[PDB]
Symmetry: C5
Subunit: 247 residues, 5 copies
């Protein structure tokens, strides 16, 4: 009979992608003092996220997202779900949130995978990847995905050896962009609607187009990739966010 | 000629998953007296569920759900549909519900299945599972699912003997998780949009990730698993719910 | 080349499933007089439907539906579409509908099919099924469905003899449910989004789960069944609806 | 090397299906004078459509649609897109439209196809079909559709002679309904979300059910039919629409 | 041992399709002062886009879109994402946007592909296509699309040579449309929900119907074409937009 050879994984920081749409009409028409009050509270919340990051308790990033799918991405990473629930609840109860609508979200956990043998969690070549720091500049590309389980294209029924080969080739394609595109892979198996969440960071959004298109020709993607929506956002420092909000 | 060998089942308590979204802006901006009044009335309702649970007439749990899919999960189990319709209507007419929006739900019945030899309804390891009590700590993972009926992967066309061997391997894979994960399977065949509802309980949400991912490599899941949305929530006792609502 | 052998059918009463969601917050917070006035008008409209049923000129049923998909199902059967258009338009124009939101619906016609030999519309064993009367108690299970037309599982390409064999087996499976489950099959080909509408009536909703699950193992269902959403509701007489509305 | 044999087509009048939902609560709660003023303006707009129809510059039809998908269908056929955009904009600007919400629509062009031999636009057996007149009575059945391109069932990869034989059989099945059902086929390739728009007109809606179901057994429909939603409406003359609006 | 041969691409201007729905009721019933102030502000915004285009630093187009999918399309092309984020942000905060609802959007980058060798960005047959100018008249047809990856129809698994042959045939079919239809292909791999965005410009919308239908018979489209929604709009100059808004 079929002998399962489950992929080995290591979990790192938990991740929450919080996408929201801005009610432009309501925000820009609100009394200036009300907007300033909301602005002070918002900055205070973000300073707290920054504080946690400096204490090595997570990472975060806020982005201006292009298109109708979302306007602002509040990305947070923490040591567990509770701190994420906290960050999410606090944002949701903020005065600024009164002018926002949740459009999409994703709960996942930083995942390091290995198809054949378990990874050494204490290896200096593995451990740092468990707690990725979000770049404070550039752009981000986020998209969820599953590994196909259809007809003759069933990733989960393949022998571990074949999966290892397919993943190695995929990793090699990705490394052509070493130093150009940073990648954070998170798993949402049993946690959200898709099996993985993927974050790509770069100083030029065109790099996202180059790497994603090229990777689609790797057999692992061509035959086994099932992709969800793609969100592209530009990193916003405090001043950039202030300008975005018209303050 | 095809001869059907339908899976044997034993039905237990009826189950209702009631997912709702909180209108943060309206709730946190509402007069303090209005919030307190809604809170007092909510406690009275939850007290009824508590007393019913103490009497062995059902069970319940309230959770803080991560993400945009839902904010609060009101889980209730009863000996029939009527008590569920009652609990559901009572919550909906409460003052607190004026600040809630229904985002998702699932109606199902606790189900114990056997592919070949019928289960002993009197077995001490069978009977108690018909009336599972919701644990009072940790987290919950809920997701609905169907058994695939596509091309060569048609679960319902398989001989009972093959389905039995497929389920045995599944049960084996999940045995290593028994110590950390509790599982409640409910059937919604002619009751809701998916064939089964699955509730996983654990003190660590990462356990949900490990078990769901590892199980996907079992042939039963890899070839016949069709999965719906995944919701993760943190169990909230009275004080936790109060704190979440800012009271 | 291909010689079609279309299924023979007899059409009876037209059917309209009108599913609505109740705005609990607005209804239960509305002034008593407005509620009583809306209730008086609603009773009168339903009374008209009841009088038509008593005259043997149609049938109706109002149900409390579990879950977020709908709260109230207004089921009506008439000799044609015109009185159904009236039924829904009048409910929508009622004051009570100011507190309702249309969530789903289905327009179909009671259909009695035969794969090979045409049915006799004047036969004592056939004619009565053309104008079924909705049970004035118990519960209802409604779900729409199609007959699969994919790859090797193409119902419409099958010879009539094979379809007759598949349907006969389906009939044998449901025979043991004769005394506990009433079934009404209606066709919506060219009338709505699905090919058929299925109504199951029983004094116990668990019977819906039992029959639907068991039948899924019949080849006709396993290979050719394509199912839509499932709605379960409890029949409400006048006093039960009054109580549901808090009056 | 695949040699394409594209279907020959002749284009006639452009077509717009404008489906809207009526805000019953708001309309029937509005002051009687406001309703009358809106009605008078609406009649005037429709009178304009009737005038151009009498001049032979188009055709129109307004229907009361069953179910939640739509309440009113404003069907218009014109020599081009511009006059359709005008009729669409004029209706949207009307006071009556303040009580309407767009639920669905379809932009297409009357199409007469031929798989092998090109059609003569001046032929008396072809020309009149380019500018069909909407029956001023009865009912309508509208549904968009595509020709399947999946696996072994790829309509667009077939040789023209096969497509011709497949369409011939379809026509033979439909000749039976010639005196009871009138059909208008419009193409929306490159114009809307589906490849074709299909309008069926008849004095009895059951005829729609009969023809659509029987045709599904033809190989062209069974293997290559990909159907969208089905809308059924009752033709409304001026007096009937007035009655529907409670005036 | 599959060896990937990824398609080479040259990237030109970044493109943003911003589709919005007009709240007709709110706009046309709003005070004249409000409408005029909004119009004057919108004109100023568009003038900035116009001047930008005159300086060869981009291109734009505003269209009246037929149907319920959108009413106005604000199309913009710029040297990067930043200018696009600025354009949609500026439009979103305008007084006019208070009367608009975002219904759809697409972020992509003009793409010139070549299946086997790098293209020369300086060739007189290549360079101009990198910065396409939106025609100031006629109509537009927009639709997103993917290249199929299903079973035996997997574009990404094909040898580069075969993909070249398929595309060459596609180009030969489009030859006859040379002087009637202008096409701009943009890639959104890693940028949006579909792999490509396609814009067709013509003085007659029927040309869109002719070319899209004919091309569907080419093997590349028949077997590998996966199409999204289709939008058709009429180009509006300042005067036409003014008239559309009743000013």
């Amino acid at each position: 009979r079929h002998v399962p050879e489950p992929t080995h994984t290591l979990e790192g920081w938990h991740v929450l992608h919080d996408f929201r749409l801005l009610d432009f009409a309501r925000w820009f028409s609100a009394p200036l003092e009300a907007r300033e009050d909301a602005w002070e509270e918002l900055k205070g919340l973000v300073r707290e996220w920054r504080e946690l990051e400096e204490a090595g308790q997570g990472s975060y990033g806020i982005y201006q997202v292009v298109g109708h799918k979302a306007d602002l991405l509040f990305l947070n990473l923490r040591p567990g779900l509770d701190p994420l629930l906290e960050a999410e609840a606090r944002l949701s109860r903020s005065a600024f949130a009164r002018y926002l609508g949740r459009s999409y979200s994703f709960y996942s956990v930083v995942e390091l995978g290995s198809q054949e043998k378990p990874l050494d969690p204490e290896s200096p070549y593995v451990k740092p990847r468990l707690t990725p720091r979000v770049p404070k500049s550039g752009y981000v590309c986020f998209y969820p995905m599953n590994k196909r389980r259809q007809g003759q294209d069933n990733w989960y029924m393949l022998p571990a050896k074949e999966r290892a080969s397919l993943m190695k080739a995929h990793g090699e394609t990705g490394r052509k962009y070493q130093g150009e595109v940073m990648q954070v892979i998170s798993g949402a198996q049993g946690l959200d609607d898709w099996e993985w969440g993927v974050d790509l960071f770069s100083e030029d959004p065109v790099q996202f187009k180059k790497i994603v298109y090229e990777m689609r020709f790797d057999e692992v993607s061509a035959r086994y990739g099932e992709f969800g929506p793609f969100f592209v956002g530009k990193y916003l420092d405090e001043e950039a966010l202030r300008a975005f909000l018209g303050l």
